[PDB]
Point group: D2
């Protein structure tokens, strides 16, 4: 028991790659894709800077995996909502981190936009 917390990330952008669908030992499927969003802003100069961010989306929700399998293609615009989680991993010699947006059973959402 830790204290209750909120951890919610909402994104709207474009799919950068063709989603990968893996099957877990047991049948359960997982889907994986990359989503681009952008910002733009003037420097503190008025010169005019831009930034694209690539978010790794990992989907465990079986119904949404299916929808991604059937319909989701590189270049599609989607809304994605989940939780933001970082994991370490080692490779036989410090650990590397990745950060992933996770869509679990009954907690995530995906809406096809375009």
């Amino acid at each position: 028991m830790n204290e209750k917390s909120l951890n919610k990330i909402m994104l709207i952008g474009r799919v950068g790659c063709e989603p990968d669908i893996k099957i877990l030992n047991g049948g359960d499927k997982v889907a994986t894709f990359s989503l681009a969003t952008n910002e733009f802003w003037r420097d503190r100069t008025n010169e005019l800077k831009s930034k694209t961010d690539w978010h790794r989306i990992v989907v465990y929700d079986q119904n949404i995996v299916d929808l991604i399998d059937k319909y989701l293609r590189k270049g599609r615009r989607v809304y994605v909502q989940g939780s933001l989680h970082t994991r370490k991993w080692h490779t036989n010699d410090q650990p590397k981190q990745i950060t992933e947006i996770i869509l679990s059973y009954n907690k995530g959402d995906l809406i096809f936009l375009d």
Copy 2:
């Protein structure tokens, strides 16, 4: 690199450290601190209770919120934070990647809780 996108993360969790307030050239301030959230869930296969605690790096460039943080935010306090999620590359070769929750002017929000 220009289509309008959405990038919004919202967290409620516990401050892990005394905030660091830095003063930049010309006097704008920037605050950073680490925020812990946790999830708790039942494994898919076994039904065992599981948890995981994530530590989020928060970076505040909003001057009104940096001031509030300077005055009021201590190790151990509970807060709501809202911002945008961005990853930046830094060295040093062997490039390194860090993921940060950024609060800029008029996009982010911080509320003091418990």
Copy 3:
């Protein structure tokens, strides 16, 4: 069948009244309370401020259980659900109520002190 949509409201504020718990036919419970949020601004006057009172209706059984046990008038909470409006009829007339609904699986409640 309609097109997929998004309807999500998040609130942090104070509970205005003692939550009401009712039992529906067949044993499901429903909980109901009122939550105050505030806004502050200057009237481009003022020095201006506004309290809004949101009706929260909770159908999620685990959350109703927590509310029954723990939620009291005056408590600060985070509430998240979806915004829905409802007409009803009296007299002789058609009124409208706005409610924030927390369904099975879709809403969340966090006690903040």
Copy 4:
């Protein structure tokens, strides 16, 4: 004079009408439109598939967003909208005050994204 609170509502749905743009004293603009969203779910006792459509009144005071709406927003477009949720009383115009509930997009607090 009041504790800090959060009031954030986010919607993706369809514009129901041609937006209405009004110009106020001194030239600030305000735009108004109705946005439809829907839910679909299985009834609890019955398992019967049910649906409900909600029409949200959106009132936009941010001038950059009012501009984009004037230029671009038409009946039938899909949009993302983010604002705060606010109820107010009016009359009536002789008797009995009436509540109306509105999603307000203030300057720098709200957001609007064209979808489809």
